[PDB]
């Protein structure tokens, strides 16, 4: 009689767990900044060594 959600997104590891039950009001997510998109046309993609890979 409780809501069941099968986790279809590929995150689940069946070798670690089968099921999790919880009081979901005791789990909290803080949204500091909502999903933000910026578009750019100047500048560089660069390596960790500081080499340019796309200008």
């Amino acid at each position: 009689g409780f809501p069941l959600n099968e986790v279809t997104s590929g995150v689940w590891d069946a070798d670690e767990a089968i099921l999790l039950g919880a009081d979901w009001s005791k789990v909290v997510i803080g949204i500091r900044q909502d999903i933000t998109f910026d578009l750019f046309s100047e500048g560089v993609i660069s390596d960790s060594d500081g080499k340019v890979v796309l200008n």
Binding site: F40, G43, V44, I45, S46
Partner: protein, 44 residues
């Protein structure tokens, strides 16, 4: 700045300096004529 989520502020200024010592009748010697003078501290 793009790939490391950052901005930068640049400040720029362009300037020239002149101290003008014309020829004077009293001291025509360029090496010792000057339009300024200084008091320095005592000793070394």
């Amino acid at each position: 700045l793009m790939q490391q989520d950052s901005k930068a502020l640049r400040v720029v200024f362009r300037v020239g300096f002149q101290v003008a010592n014309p020829m004077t009748r009293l001291n025509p010697n360029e090496a010792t004529r000057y339009p300024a003078g200084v008091i320095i501290p005592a000793g070394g």
